[PDB]
């Protein structure tokens, strides 16, 4: 009961063009492809979000490196 129609918009406006230091990330949650574009935001050991295109090489590569974030 409440903001039930307000789904979690885990989508970002743009993805990071700079290549993250793969190791620096600890996990990656999938951004819904229903938003502007399919993406995966990475959670660093600092809890910082980094939105990336799941269709981008360096993005899928990290996703195959770090596990999926449960949050």
UniProtKB/Swiss-Prot annotation:
The source organism is Human herpesvirus 8 type P (isolate GK18)
Family listed? Belongs to the intercrine beta (chemokine CC) family.
- Where is it mainly found? secreted
Q: Protein name, please?
A: Viral macrophage inflammatory protein 2
Cysteines joined through disulfide linkages: 11-35, 12-51
Keyword Oxidoreductase recorded: no
> So what does this one do?
Blocks infection by several different human immunodeficiency virus type 1 (HIV-1) strains. This occurs because vMIP-II binds to a wide range of chemokine receptors. May form part of the response to host defenses contributing to virus-induced neoplasia and may have relevance to KSHV and HIV-I interactions.
GO biological process: any one? immune response
Q: How does it assemble?
A: Monomer. Interacts with human chemokine receptor CXCR4.
Q: Where in the cell is it found?
A: Secreted
Give the source's domain of life in one word: Viruses
Q: Which gene encodes it?
A: ORF K4
Q: Which GO terms describe its cellular component?
A: extracellular space; protein-containing complex
Single GO MF annotation: CXCR chemokine receptor binding
Parent-protein residues present: 24 to 94 of 94
Keywords recorded for this protein, A-Z: Cytokine, Disulfide bond, Secreted, Signal
